[PDB]
Every structure is written in structure tokens, then in C-alpha cells.
């Protein structure tokens, strides 16, 4: 079958260089025009650029904002497409999709989550959510990057447990509030993977 | 957990150790004295005893006067007693600082409670209970037979506890299979292969579609199942003009 | 200029029902070969998008028959004969006449349909252990609500609220919302919604 396997994730700070490699398997690479499309968190697609097919002329065309800095290249002999992400910014903190056509994005590959933040890697600052009088919750905020898993009763309660998605503050950190809704005392543990910081909290109003 | 526990427990040797015997619980529990308790009932005819020095050695001496398996454990240390309970910080909480209790998943089986539990209490508190209370391993094993568990695979390099599981069924009507682990002196893959063969013989479900993945084997024609054929035939009843 | 397109952003679907998603274009996307130039795309929740329909009506290979496309030069319509859970996602209406392609448009947010839910508004004042580090966040916990068309106001004004919209589930097929009001020391010393489940604003404070 056809695959558009991707690579090029990692850590970059504002003003660095990165590489996005797309390997196409299943068809001839030379006659399809590569495109790079990127999914900003919270919304759908935004097209970054595309290079024309080798025989069309290999004429690259990016979006006016990302024109110049980003460099789209390809090659048949080793069958690889490069997206040279130079001078990464807060708009590059997004998922990136290798699309199999300049004007027909067919396979979309898999999707590489490229992060561009100036924050560091520390564990969460778990703050409780005391019920008014109800639901019982606790915060996760002051953590980065995004591996995350918050359960309640330490994986014992699953009905009514609902952990909120990440929220990005202007200072470059991530925000989660996990919540349960059941009358009653409840315990919440948060595991921060990159630094391995597990914090446990019990809540009363 | 285990590393810090061993590191800090390495100081108590010289005062107390443990031993493991296959004697019935009755006589040993009757004759224990001078700071002795049964650490773990591993069966009606198997007990691990945690007692002080100069008499626990004499407990395995009393067991060699009755001529049973005498193993003076060279790894003797203090547990299931008060010589380790006095450390309420290093031996009670320092071992486990992080813990991720899981849900039901595949039913595991704790011992200190003697019954099946959810995996929530598996933390430093469990090691505190192991160092404070007894084990009651036989109670958990009997719970295994009650919940349908008979085949026991010993995760070790020498069978010492499946030996005891064989005395679980030596007085119980529910005779259960306790696999022979790698013999004392076996450290090669041939022994692991024979252990796997024995486990399959006992009834252990072995996914053979995983052992043959790295070998790159090929399926070859083999004889089919030899149907043990009876003489099953239903002839017509009537006899003409009777 | 550019052919800027609109669509029914919040079209609901329910299992066992045929659905009719649409797109409207300012100009005419019909080509000189009489070939409409619109591409219906599907993005799964948290997965790679897929090409459902090209050239207005035709399939892509591997895409189930349950999607059909039609329409004129300006109005385009995709009917889903048999709605499924993989069908639920975001539907993209892509034009081809002009490519630069700056954005993919608002997109049609497709959700599994139940009746209108009762929004549970829960005010959580920030904990006192939050107040030691100089931060504060009272969370208006909107829960079990449908659709996701509710804004949360912060009075007694707004502007410091951050958005957390959540995953719609299987057994309940509802929404949850977090309007996180990150706050500072002095200004700490009420949230209400206008969701369609109720009419009068229900205002409760910390």
C-alpha cells in the first residue's frame, strides 16, 4: 500500500532550525507534488507550502508569511522530502502533515507534533478544586511539554472522570484541570513523564 | 523499592534472619518460642519462619532432626518483625515514593490480606504490611483454587515455592499443578525450554506464535490427529418375515 | 479575488440517519470542462485527514460509498447515507480554481446527535494553596452540555478567560467546558452562560 511516514520531532527554541522528513512508499515519488500542511492547536488545517513535481519544474511555493525561511526539497533516488524549518516561531508550535499533492492532499501521512516553546521541563503544581457545597477536581497547571495522564481514585473511578485538554498560556506553559462529578474524599495523582514528577492530592471543600 | 530496602536492611544482620521449611504449620507453631513468628504460611506443609539468631538456626536444626529440607538461607535478614518496623521512614516510606495503582486489569493476588484485592494497596504500605504482619500465603493459594487457579509457574531460578504448592494439593482434594522451575544449577536456555514444555504439559496456555517468531521457522506437513476409532454403527432394525 | 466559502459549521448527525452537509462558494467553481472544482475532506478526531470526494461528486479509492457528492457551480452538497462514528469529525470544503491555500476554512464540526442537554454550571473558587505562589484561577466548570455554543462571562470584566473545550464521548455524547480565569494577587479580592439548554442566565459566584 501507500505510506507517507514522517519524522522530525524534537525541541526547538524561537530562532532555531529543524528538519521534517517524509518518506513515500507505494508509488513513484517524482510525479506527485509534495505539500506541507500544519494543524494549529484548536482548529483544522492551514497549508504551509508545496514544491512542484520534479518534471513540472520543482517550483516551490510557500505561504506569504512562511515564504523564504522554510525550504521545501525532495529527491527520488532516496525518495525523501525535506521541509527545512528555519527560524521557528510560536505559529510553528503545531502538528505538521505531509500531503501527497499540490492541489490534491491524498494520504496526509501520520502527523508530526512540532513544539516551539521557551519554557523548561518541570513537574506539575497540583492545586485542588474545592467544591462549593457537586464536583471535585484538582489542577495540573505549571507543566510542560505534553505527555500527560490524570486519573481519579488512582485508576479506580472511570465513570464521571473527565480530564480537560491542554491550554497554552502566553508564558509558554500548559494547563489541565481534571474533574469528577459525583456526590460524596477523592484522590487525584498526576504523573509528569519527561521529569518523572508524580504529585498526589486529596480534596475537601 | 527493593534496592533501598536491601541497602538499608543490610545493617540488621547479626541480630535476626529468616529460614524456609516444608514442615506442617501445627508442630512448628506449637514449638516456636523466644521471639519467633511464622513469617509466611506457604501451605499446610510449608512455612517460612522469621526468628532471631541462635534459635532460628536451631529451628532448622530441629527440622534436620526430623530430616526435612534444610536450607540455612545465606541471605538471612530481618522482616515481618519489630527489628525492621522501628524504621518508619526509610523502611516504610522511602522505598516507595511514587506509585501508580492500576484498575482490575487481570486479577492479581495479594497475600497479606489473604484474599483477592484491587491493585490500589500496592505501594510502600504493602511493604510495611510485609514487614509488620505475616504473609498468609496459603490463604491466598486456597483463594486461588476457589477462584479457579491450579497451574503455578515459579518465577525463580530454583523451585522452592512450587515445591510447597505441591504440598498445597498433598492434603487438599483439589490437586493442583505446581510447575518444576529451573533446577538449582540450571542457567541456560535449554532449561527454560524444558520448563516451557512442562508448563504446556501442565496446562499453561503458551502462545506458540511468539516463541517461533525469532527462529524464522517453516510449517511442514505432519501427521494429523490419530482418531481412536470405536465401532459405532446403527443397523436397520427389522428382520424380514419374523 | 479569492473564492471564500461558507458551510454549516455545526451540523449534527445521529446514527442510522442520512445527513446533508453543504458548502457555498462566492464564485463559480465549475471548470471549462464542466467539472466542478470542490474537494470534500474528512479529519477524524485526533487523526490524519482523509480525501473523501474530489471533482465535486466522485469518490476517492478506499473511502466507503456512504459519502456521495453533488451540487451546482456555487452550491455543493455531500449526503452521508449511513452515518457512523468515524464519519463524525471535521468536514473540509476545499476549492481548486485558485491555489494559494491560506486556510482550510472554519470547517463543519460534526457531532453525534442527542437531545438538548442540561448545562451543569459549577463554580470552583481557587484553593488557598494556589494563593501562595501569586496566581489564582476560579474555574467555571460547564458540564454535560450540548451543543458547544455557550460563552462564559466573568463579571463583578471579562478578557482574562482562556478556553478549554473538551472531547464528546460515546455513552453520553455531551460536552464539557473550562473557562480558566488565571488571575493575580490583588484583583482576586461570578460566571454565567447563555447555553441553549436554558433561557435565563444562571449566575453563581465564588
From TrEMBL, chain B:
This is 6-deoxyerythronolide-B synthase. Involved in the biosynthesis of antibiotic erythromycin via the biosynthesis of its aglycone precursor, 6-deoxyerythronolide B (6-dEB). It comes from Saccharopolyspora erythraea (Streptomyces erythraeus). Homodimer. Erythronolide synthase is composed of EryAI, EryAII and EryAIII multimodular (2 modules) polypeptides each coding for a functional synthase subunit which participates in 2 of the six FAS-like elongation steps required for formation of the polyketide. Module 1, 2, 3, 4, 5, and 6 participating in biosynthesis steps 1, 2, 3, 4, 5, and 6, respectively. The lineage of its organism: Bacteria, Bacillati, Actinomycetota, Actinomycetes, Pseudonocardiales. It comes from the Bacteria.
